[PDB]
Design a binder for this molecule. Structure first.
Ligand SMILES: CCCCCCCCCCCCCCCC(=O)O
Ligand SMILES: CCCCCCCCCCCCCCCC(=O)O
Ligand SMILES: CCCCCCCCCCCCCC(=O)O
Ligand SMILES: CCCCCCCCCCCCCC(=O)O
Lengths: 178, 56, 254, 266, 254, 266, 56
């Protein structure tokens, strides 16, 4: 699911046993394999440092008869990838419910000892994690397709900055284009 | 024409003179920072405050 | 004020935003406050811990079936294992807090049902056998819901609590449970229920492991229903936040 | 720079700065102090190393062409354009209409070749790099009439000193450079379509001034551009597929991002 | 201001009124205006034609299938055959205008889907074969939609445009196409999308047949869907209005 | 700076500025005029050649790496650090947290190699010493794409002139450099323990720009640091055992001082 | 910005100008001497005069 537009939509179902996870990934702009390509991941690769916040927006794109709640947690690194939902609820989180201006914005704050960080993957200056769990099932009346997808946006906050301009390793040339 | 302007401090002065006729012989305007985000973020017509709900 | 039906709550580190909700019922008319120095008897100094304790700890979820009777939780005990609220609860000896109960249950416009979200102060219970008294593993779950039944209790096991939903298990009329603060969840026009409860108790500060302050009860007065061709799984979740916590009497753990 | 933060207390009102609609094409403006309770910390940072003035004004290689000293056709020439190197091309394609000056620089080098004479003692060499605008004379050998340079600007430089540098105004026909063109050149809408329809920019010639030797020497020049006073309009998304043609935008479709072995895997 | 979700637009002779819509995104922050006499180089006098040119010309329609990839149009060329905008476009030699793009797609509360309505300035494209350059009959339709594909391009026909939707055909990341002005169409809560674009171009006035100003792209990021027992045909239409038109250099037709 | 002296007369009081207690961790403050009768002499000296500003700001060798011109792997590289020479290492380890600038300097040299050609005439050579910060591109040969230096800072210098010099700000992550680290890098408290856990500092590359010759030349660069604006905190005792590892503190225990043949022998 | 300051005499003046933008291009602050010994010698809490006995 990378050579199509299916790599952009998170699939949500309606299942029996609650506490199912929907998605998750580590928090590393320009380092992780998910954020190293977006609009913030292509500008953050021209530099070496960064410090600030991040606004993550969502948009439930199901039918107008659909319903449900969700949880969104950011656990700083002392022990990552919380297995259960109750392990993630201890960290910073928010509860979002769909319908009538569905889109909700989670604000990953800035919590680090030092002032800046490295865009490269450095184990000394790790950032954290990000996950989302089923707070309540997806209920739907009859005659409605139960599979509904969600899109995940990302953007920078207003206390953001960069430093130490460098050259990005993506483009690579072999010879002069005649 | 010499101007005694400020320098880039972490948190003084430094002189400067031009010696040529044209304007393409001066140095870059590095010491200039002007920001306006409203053009790209929030291009909507009606102004939206974050307290009130988005769509009614 | 535009579009009343939308709220937003940012308490500490978490934020819960609903788009379709009713009003917010605030306790007996008071907002939870700290303990003045005119009504205290402790001789030590308190410990207002952090923003790290006034957060939104979400408990377990359950399925709203078509024959389920009702669930309940014990409030000071359900948050015993959650984060830095469960460490400053057992390392210390005293404490007083208030909560902000929340509930989520969302269904389409083709489902129906109702629920009574109410919290009861000083909730007692009745054992199955009359002579004995109820157990502890049958009175409080480890942040897992306890559920009523339809058949009354039987005669076992001489310690089980009596799960007679129409009497509520406390020995009162279930229809009279609207005196304590509460809110209804009607899937026709509602999607959640918020409740702010202050600290109500005789003494100023009370233990946390020996005496449970409140009790949260959920009872569907009108069972779920739906025609063929719709999702048959409707889950429920609850999110609670300790408000204005304090402690005294530091000792070793337990 | 950046802005400060503000101290927040617990709230139970109906402000809800979190839930919004994204259909309106409006990026939110939520700060961390709105969604949770935080402290008050005054930021001392500064957004200075990221402005377009500081981001673009660095020199980079563009094209290195060599010319032997052996025969009467030793000289070498180059047609001006900026889409010949991958590093500086992609640093332009985040905008659409630019405006800048330039500061050229030529790092010339030399080298010997095999010969049979007994001894060799090569004095310093000199150049002689010329600039011919569009629609003008042209040289064909290293002993032509065109090398007089009665009005053309030339640069003479002897090997061993610092490299030559000079400036250039905003020489163009339109009110700003155009990095992307959508449309043809003929009014009949036939023939050439790409971006080179409005790119001539002149030429560039180089040559050895010395008479001859016994080596004979071979040389390679290297150009270096440095946009000085930039101004950018209408940004656009960066590139994702490699470059494969000098005057086209042809590409080969690739995946949007590298892959991980799961959706929930870290 | 009451009931934000309703707009109304009367430009010239036509009027388009929607009841369920989002906000209106106005260009890069400017309203389309005429050309001042401080930035002009034409030596003739312009021709502000009429209200007869600033109208709502509706283009063709298409079906939103369950496997379709995306459509696009070229703006100065799509209105070449419409009314007195296509006569003053070819009789003259210069011109500058701005548009007010609109889109309609309405479904019930039992359908789902989404779309990205965006206009890109100076949209280039890439031929199938690397050596050659794209054709013209494969780059612009006569006010009929051009559509992307799923398979990449093949190797034909040495002139066809590469319809690789996930790369957009321009050679960029499709997820980064939110920089240019735009609006989403979510059938859950949306029914249309309005966009006002000014004249953006290097020179003051440019030809109309030799260089296309903008490009309108429509891409459904989430395909349509519906349970059995509903209308399986969902069509799409677009309505565009030239705003603040001007011309120069009168000659014979072409 | 120094202070004067004061004239003292005979005394028989109970002042006793001599006897004190040393358990209190307090160095005494007895001057010679307190314990005996002395004259009055006003000192004109000055404690100037001993302050940290004057004591540290002298250039010293750090590392000299050489690179031949023979093959396609001629270039040579070095990883930044200051604990590679014994003279400048121990002049840092009398403090714990420093803060300074620097003024680099490269004294490049050359030399011939055996060959078989008849004559040899080598024009001047040029460099081309690059700096790559951590997390960036890297070259692998002397004809790579990385040598364009579109944003990296480079220095070009032709042999025969004065050596190149330049400054460097306080480039670090913390509020002061750390010369001693006590603790690991992994949160699990396993693996690497020493001081190099918080030392990356980038790299440094060098290369011949000339095409080739008949020698061919061999060269050796030499670095020179000069801390300019110093600030020191938390002094500590100097070193007594020799250095034996680049990124450790391992030593071999030795006697505290050389020995004399008696306790009363002079 | 030029300052005419003093020189280092055994027991006059000397001009100086800065020519750059940054602050890392100036010369060292050699002509600065500031002493305070109280931090390392005598860090005790109670102040002790040398006349009175040390410990009672
Ligand atoms: C000896 C002095 C010679 C000066 C030569 C001037 C070179 C002109 C540079 C043209 C601008 C660069 C191209 C920008 C847009 C394009 O054409 O792709
Ligand atoms: C061509 C210019 C290149 C400039 C290179 C800058 C060198 C950086 C020096 C780093 C500071 C010295 C190390 C101090 C502490 C340590 O890491 O041991
Ligand atoms: C060619 C310039 C020579 C160096 C300058 C010496 C100082 C002469 C006085 C210059 C005063 C110009 C007015 C000004 O301060 O801007
Ligand atoms: C680039 C500097 C050129 C040499 C200086 C010539 C004198 C010009 C006047 C300088 C006065 C600056 C103010 C000051 O005295 O500090």
């Amino acid at each position: 699911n990378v050579n199509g537009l299916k790599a952009y939509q998170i699939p949500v179902q309606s299942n029996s046993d609650n506490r199912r996870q929907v998605f998750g990934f580590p928090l590393q702009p320009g380092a992780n394999n998910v954020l190293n390509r977006t609009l913030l991941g292509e500008i953050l690769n021209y530099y070496t440092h960064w410090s600030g916040s991040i606004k993550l927006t969502f948009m439930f794109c199901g039918s107008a008869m659909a319903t449900g709640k969700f949880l969104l947690a950011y656990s700083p690194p002392g022990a990552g990838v919380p297995k259960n939902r109750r392990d993630a609820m201890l960290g910073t989180h928010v509860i979002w419910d769909v319908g009538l201006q569905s889109s909700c914005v989670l604000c990953v704050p800035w919590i680090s000892q030092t002032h800046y960080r490295y865009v490269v993957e450095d184990e000394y200056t790790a950032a954290g994690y990000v996950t989302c769990w089923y707070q309540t099932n997806i209920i739907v009346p009859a005659d409605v397709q139960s599979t509904c997808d969600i899109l995940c946006f990302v953007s920078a906050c207003n206390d953001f900055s960069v430093r130490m301009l460098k050259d990005t390793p993506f483009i690579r040339q072999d010879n002069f284009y005649q | 024409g010499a101007q005694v302007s400020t320098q880039k401090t972490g948190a003084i002065h430094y002189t400067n003179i031009n010696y040529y006729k044209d304007a393409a012989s001066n140095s870059a305007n590095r010491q200039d920072f002007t920001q306006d985000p409203g053009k790209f973020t929030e291009p909507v017509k009606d102004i939206m405050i974050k307290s009130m709900p988005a769509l009614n | 004020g535009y579009s009343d039906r939308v709220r937003s709550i940012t308490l500490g580190n978490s934020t819960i935003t609903t788009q379709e909700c009713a009003n917010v019922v605030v306790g007996y008319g008071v907002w939870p406050e700290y303990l003045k120095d005119n009504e205290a008897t402790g001789e030590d100094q308190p410990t207002q811990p952090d923003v790290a304790t006034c957060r939104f700890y979400t408990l377990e979820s359950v399925q709203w079936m078509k024959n389920s009777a009702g669930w309940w939780w014990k409030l000071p005990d359900a948050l015993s294992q959650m984060g830095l609220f469960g460490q400053n609860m057992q390392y210390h000896y005293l404490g007083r807090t208030g909560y902000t109960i929340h509930v989520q249950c969302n269904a389409s416009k083709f489902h129906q049902g109702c629920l009574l979200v109410v919290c009861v102060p000083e909730a007692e219970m009745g054992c199955s056998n009359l002579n004995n008294t109820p157990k502890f593993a049958e009175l409080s779950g480890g942040d897992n819901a306890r559920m009523f039944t339809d058949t009354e209790v039987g005669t076992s096991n001489d310690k089980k609590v009596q799960t007679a939903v129409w009497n509520a298990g406390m020995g009162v009329g279930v229809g009279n449970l609207t005196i304590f603060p509460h809110q209804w969840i009607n899937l026709r026009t509602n999607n959640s229920a918020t409740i702010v409860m202050p600290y109500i108790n005789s003494v100023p500060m009370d233990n946390m492991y020996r005496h449970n302050n409140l009790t949260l009860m959920i009872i569907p007065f009108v069972p779920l229903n739906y025609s063929e061709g719709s999702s048959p799984y409707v889950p429920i979740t609850v999110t609670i936040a300790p408000m204005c916590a304090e402690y005294n009497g530091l000792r070793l753990a337990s | 720079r950046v802005a400060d933060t503000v101290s927040s207390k617990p709230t139970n009102s109906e402000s809800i700065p979190a839930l919004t609609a994204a259909e309106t094409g409006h990026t939110s403006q939520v700060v961390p102090s709105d969604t949770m309770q935080t402290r008050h910390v005054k930021n001392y940072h500064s957004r200075s190393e990221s402005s377009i003035e500081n981001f673009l004004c660095r020199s980079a290689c563009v094209y290195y062409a060599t010319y032997n000293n052996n025969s009467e056709k030793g000289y070498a020439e180059w047609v001006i354009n900026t889409r010949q190197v991958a590093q500086l091309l992609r640093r332009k394609l985040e905008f659409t209409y630019l405006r800048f000056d330039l500061e050229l620089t030529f790092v010339i080098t030399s080298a010997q070749e095999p010969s049979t004479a007994t001894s060799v003692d090569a004095p310093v060499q000199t150049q002689q790099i010329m600039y011919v605008p569009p629609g003008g004379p042209v040289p064909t050998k290293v002993t032509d009439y065109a090398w007089q340079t009665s009005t053309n600007p030339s640069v003479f430089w002897t090997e061993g000193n610092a490299p030559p540098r000079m400036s250039i105004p905003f020489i163009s026909i339109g009110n700003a450079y155009s990095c992307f063109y959508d449309g043809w050149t003929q009014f009949s809408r036939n023939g050439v379509y790409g971006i080179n329809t409005l790119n001539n920019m002149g030429t560039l010639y180089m040559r050895h001034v010395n008479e001859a030797g016994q080596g004979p020497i071979k040389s390679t020049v290297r150009i270096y551009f440095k946009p000085k006073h930039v101004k950018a309009w209408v940004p656009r998304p960066p590139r994702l597929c490699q470059y494969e043609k000098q005057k086209n935008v042809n590409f080969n479709p690739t995946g949007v991002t590298t892959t991980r072995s799961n959706i929930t895997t870290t």
